[PDB]
């Protein structure tokens, strides 16, 4: 051949049990809003009801984990204390 | 500034050194297996989305036989651990060294010209439509 | 008798339930991969030599094409996310369900008649020399 | 075809860092006797100098592992108490 690849340096991202398509706290969907907001609108305040991303790559509705921090505080899918780093998606 | 963003900073740096250890680990794994021939010299870095944002859209365009086989091997390895969750399909990051061939001058492609050059290798005389 | 051999007994039983969890884990990992028509229905278990002794010699007989592909997939999976584990090749253990075909009656082979029946499928009219 | 395999149920055994061909305590070989025995015979009492198998699936010479157990029992490779479960090979 005329051009042959010798080296490569991809960077491979990874996701834990985020289950893209369901939230582990309320079980609704990665979208479709949450149990507290029910319908997509239903007073969602300019769609502020967004997804929250932990340091352990676990994704829930911001609302569903926020309310889980008024009772527990250690991320239900492992044991890590859980942080509030990345947001949205 | 204080310890409030410097925490995410340590996050990133840790990601870096840990992915360097992961590169040495995968080198021994490729010496034990390395089925896909396309997967040769690989600097696969395992970073967390919790620190590194998505560049624009995280694309999944045609992968080139060498980097395609390479991406398949990497995804199979990454899913051997997290059942299902494999290497995220992306092309907007990284680089490569294209060994061209009067001498053998090695080029460089930043994960963007690999697919077009591979399609040229398969068949030259292409255009925008192809 | 007391807690002196009952310890190895717990060892064996634990091996068992843990290999059942490992079977569910491999089902997940073969749903992400398992592209070959060789992993239609797989029931690979994982035991330790520290509790399960060698039967006679742990031989290295030729495996059959579809069992060959299944064993290759299982070994590739094991030689990756596992903690330095070495998938061993053994024929003196296990079973199988041979789907024969007026109806389709499924037979059963205990990892001993798979190779001979596969050689018959490749070409009939064989003997001891073949 | 006339016969097609549908199910399979192999059982796959596994070995840790036993390194079939070397002992991690004395570094001699899986055979070739140990550093406390040197030559194959050299008064090996009817070849009683055999291989020891741990629960952690590690394999070193009997004499070598005896000295390690005499001090601290934590396995030179990983971190297991090490039991005399299996023996020989
Ligand atoms: Zn939710
Ligand atoms: Zn909500
Ligand atoms: Zn988590
Ligand atoms: Zn030794
Ligand atoms: Zn000795
Ligand atoms: Zn050990």
Curated annotation (Swiss-Prot), chains A, D:
ZnF locations on chain (RING-type): 34-79
GO terms under biological process: cellular response to amino acid stimulus; cellular response to chemical stress; cellular response to oxidative stress; cellular response to UV; DNA damage response; MAPK cascade; negative regulation of canonical Wnt signaling pathway; negative regulation of insulin receptor signaling pathway
Annotated binding of Zn(2+) 3, by residue: 56, 58, 75, 78
Region of the whole protein represented: 20 to 108 of 108
Intrachain disulfide bonds: none
GO molecular function: cullin family protein binding; molecular adaptor activity; NEDD8 ligase activity; NEDD8 transferase activity; protein-containing complex binding; RNA polymerase II-specific DNA-binding transcription factor binding; ubiquitin protein ligase activity; ubiquitin protein ligase binding
Outcome when changing residue 72 to E: Impairs UBE2R2 activation by neddylated Cul2-RING(FEM1C) complex
Keyword Ribonucleoprotein attached: no
Protein name according to UniProt: E3 ubiquitin-protein ligase RBX1
Keyword Manganese part of the UniProt annotation: no
Lineage per the UniProt record: Eukaryota, Metazoa, Chordata, Craniata, Vertebrata
Name of the coding gene: RBX1
Assembly and binders: Component of multiple Cul1-RING E3 ubiquitin-protein ligase complexes commonly known as SCF (SKP1-CUL1-F-box) complexes, consisting of CUL1, SKP1, RBX1 and a variable F-box domain-containing protein. Part of a SCF(SKP2) complex consisting of CUL1, RBX1, SKP1 and SKP2. Part of a SCF(FBXO3) complex consisting of CUL1, FBXO3, RBX1 and SKP1; this complex interacts with PML via FBXO3. Component of the SCF(Cyclin F) complex consisting of CUL1, RBX1, SKP1 and CCNF. Identified in a SCF E3 ubiquitin ligase complex together with HINT1 and CDC34.
Curated annotation (Swiss-Prot), chains B, C:
Subcellular location: Nucleus; Golgi apparatus; Cell projection, Cilium, Flagellum; Cytoplasm, Cytoskeleton, Spindle
PTM annotation, UniProt: Neddylated. Attachment of NEDD8 is required for the E3 ubiquitin-protein ligase activity of the BCR complex. Deneddylated via its interaction with the COP9 signalosome (CSN) complex.
Similarity comment: Belongs to the cullin family.
Chain's role: Core component of multiple cullin-RING-based BCR (BTB-CUL3-RBX1) E3 ubiquitin-protein ligase complexes which mediate the ubiquitination and subsequent proteasomal degradation of target proteins. BCR complexes and ARIH1 collaborate in tandem to mediate ubiquitination of target proteins. As a scaffold protein may contribute to catalysis through positioning of the substrate and the ubiquitin-conjugating enzyme.
Known disease link: Pseudohypoaldosteronism 2E: An autosomal dominant disorder characterized by severe hypertension, hyperkalemia, hyperchloremia, hyperchloremic metabolic acidosis, and correction of physiologic abnormalities by thiazide diuretics.
Assembly with partners or alone: Forms neddylation-dependent homodimers. Component of multiple BCR (BTB-CUL3-RBX1) E3 ubiquitin-protein ligase complexes formed of CUL3, RBX1 and a variable BTB domain-containing protein acting as both, adapter to cullin and substrate recognition subunit. The BCR complex may be active as a heterodimeric complex, in which NEDD8, covalently attached to one CUL3 molecule, binds to the C-terminus of a second CUL3 molecule. Interacts with RBX1, RNF7, CYCE and TIP120A/CAND1. Part of the BCR(SPOP) containing SPOP, and of BCR containing homodimeric SPOPL or the heterodimer formed by SPOP and SPOPL.
Further facts: High-glucose conditions in renal tubular epithelial cells lead to up-regulation of CUL3 expression, significant increase in CUL3-mediated ubiquitination of MRPL12 and dysregulation of mitochondrial biosynthesis.
Protein name per its UniProtKB record: Cullin-3
The organism of origin for this protein: Homo sapiens
Positions spanned in the full protein: 462 to 615 of 768
